[PDB]
Symmetry: D2
């Protein structure tokens, strides 16, 4: 199934792109929300950018664990990798949305 089905493969790649675009939108909107509540507060935007950088490193480290049993480059590996990236990105997007609403 995942080892051979074109739509499973194509949609895993496609949904990773959608999840990444939605995360970028969430990040961009958090910056604007934080600026609305706090102005360009000293260190704030740099701290948000630094955290997001470390997050992207974690995302990749965790996806290397989650996909450890799959063969790099295989259909199954790409689907697993892409699903992991999408899910992790969705969860990060939710977290960034939640931060803008801390009053």
């Amino acid at each position: 199934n995942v080892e051979t089905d074109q739509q499973t493969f194509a949609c895993a790649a496609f949904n990773k792109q959608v999840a990444e675009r939605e995360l970028q939108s969430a990040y961009d909107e958090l910056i604007e929300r934080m600026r609305d509540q706090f102005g360009d507060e000293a260190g704030l935007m740099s701290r948000i950018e630094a955290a997001e950088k470390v997050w992207s490193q974690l995302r990749d480290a965790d996806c290397k664990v989650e996909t450890h049993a799959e063969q790099p480059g295989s259909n199954a590996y790409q689907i697993a990798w892409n699903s992991c990236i999408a899910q992790r990105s969705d969860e990060r997007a939710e977290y960034l949305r939640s931060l803008g609403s801390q009053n």
Copy 2:
């Protein structure tokens, strides 16, 4: 310990206060953005009611190995409720962010 017991109870209270604040601020955000949109307040209220039912059902699963009415069960129950509440608060804060 009296202290494990007291802190588990206190931290549940704190988590529920923050959840209530997240809920109230969501309602205000939604009204700000969408006004008296038909059904909107009612959908949010209904969802949160079902959530509290899930919270108790999941906590009954998580505490299954403890003896109900025991101090240990109550610590475990409070800890589960607190964590579930924190997760729900994050989710409500994430809603109506556009």
Copy 3:
């Protein structure tokens, strides 16, 4: 974009099905893990089934809030609905996996 693109629409529906199948697998495996650690403990499997039932009700209630600004039946609504179902299902699957590992 989401209002008109076929692949966005098709992959949102497809990934909802994948997420639901993965959740069912996680649920089925939790039952087996709980049985391995505790046997058919009085009330345990019924409590797990009851919780999952309420969860499915919550999933739908929450997705009705998340999609409130979209028009029922529209491309945008279906994509939003399906993405919400998929994300909620992924998060539930992770939670059920985590429960089997509570020692």
Copy 4:
């Protein structure tokens, strides 16, 4: 309150103990299922190290409105660490479940 301060600190300790247990049990599950698979223990260790760096970076964002070194900042810091730890523990428990 001395009690808010003490419970926030205590609950951080509890959350970190449960996270360490989740981490240790994950390692045991992984060894049970995959043996000395090349790179596997090292990948899990490396990921958890990066996670602790993210935890501190995100907590610095969450506590940005408080004065560092203040009792209020430390309560807020401990609460953030505890919740982040609980979330990580759930995630590690979810790994190697097949």
